[PDB]
Amino acid sequence: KLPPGWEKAMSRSSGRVYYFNHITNASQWERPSGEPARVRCSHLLVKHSQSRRPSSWRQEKITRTKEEALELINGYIQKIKSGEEDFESLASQFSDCSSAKARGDLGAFSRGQMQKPFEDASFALRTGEMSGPVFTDSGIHIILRTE
Ligand SMILES: CN1CCN(C)C1=O
Ligand SMILES: [Cl-]
């Protein structure tokens, strides 16, 4: 029927159908279009008090709750999708990962090297696509597949 992971849904506020992917947490109005050994990705990470290491270059002690970290992630997605901000600008300014200094770029990788939810989401994205909120033991991610 549809590419790996997609299903049909119905909007509560409008009644119009849309499409949702349960591996990447992406959602969109348009019908999805149409595996390699390696992919290249960038990300933006927001940590919280239950993160495996609750600290980062922005903050020596990270105290925000998990629910608060999800609201921040949701707001960044809104501004990227409306075009008010670029994915690379927000990651340089607000990502709790050391890769912030490289506009979020993590380089290329294979199956076996990253935390499993991040890996499954990275390899189900198409080239140029962005994920929704993805959860690991580091925190909450937005993923952009560049190659
Ligand atoms: C093991 N790593 C490095 C960065 N990332 C998202 C991981 O899961
Ligand atoms: Cl592709």
- 76 in ligand 1 pocket by Cβ < 6 Å? no
DSSP 48-107: -TTSSS--BTTBSS----HHHHHHHHHHHHHHHHHTSS-HHHHHHHH-SSGGGGGTTEEE
Return left, alpha or beta for 106; rule: phi > 0 is left, psi -120 to 50 is alpha, else beta. Answer: alpha
Q: How far is the CA of 19 from the centre of ligand 1 (A)?
A: 28
Mutate to test the pocket of ligand 1, among 113, 116, 131 (most ligand atoms within 8 A of CB): 113
Cα 71 to ligand 2 centroid, rounded to whole Å: 30
24 with 51, same domain: the answer is no
Q: Write the single-letter amino acid at 26.
A: A
| Angstrom distance (rounded) from CA 41 to CA 143 | 7
Q: What is the DSSP letter of 128?
A: T
Q: Are residues 65 and 131 in the same domain?
A: yes
Whether residue 143 contacts residue 122, with contact meaning beta carbons closer than 8 Å, is answered with: yes
- Same domain for 117 and 46: yes
Pairing relation of β-strands 38-46 and 139-145? Answer: antiparallel
Experimental method: X-ray
42 and 22, same domain (yes or no): no
First to last CA, the chain: 25
CA distance 5 to 124: 8
For residue 110, give the H/E element and its range.
Answer: strand 105-110
Say if residue 86 is in the same domain as residue 136.
yes
| Distance of alpha carbon 133 from alpha carbon 46, whole angstroms | 10
Q: Which residues contact 12 (CB under 8 A, 6 or more apart)?
A: none
Residue 24: which domain range? Answer: 1-32
What is the domain count for the chain?
Answer: 2
66 and 44, same structural domain?
yes
User: What does R_g of the chain's alpha carbons equal in angstroms?
Assistant: 16
Q: How many angstroms does the Cα of residue 47 sit away from the middle of ligand 2? A: 29
CATH classification of the domain holding 1: 2.20.70.10
Tokens of 87: 């994915």
C-alpha count within 13 angstroms, C-beta hemisphere, residue 110: 2
Q: Which two tokens stand for residue 120?
A: 């499954």
- The verdict on 25 and 62 lying in the same domain is no
Question: Which residues share a beta bridge with 45?
Answer: 141
> Residue 58's domain is classified under what CATH number?
3.10.50.40
Evaluated on CA atoms 110, 102, 91, 33, the torsion sign reads: negative
Question: In this structure, are 94 and 135 located in the same domain?
Answer: yes
Mark whether 19 and 70 lie in a shared domain. no
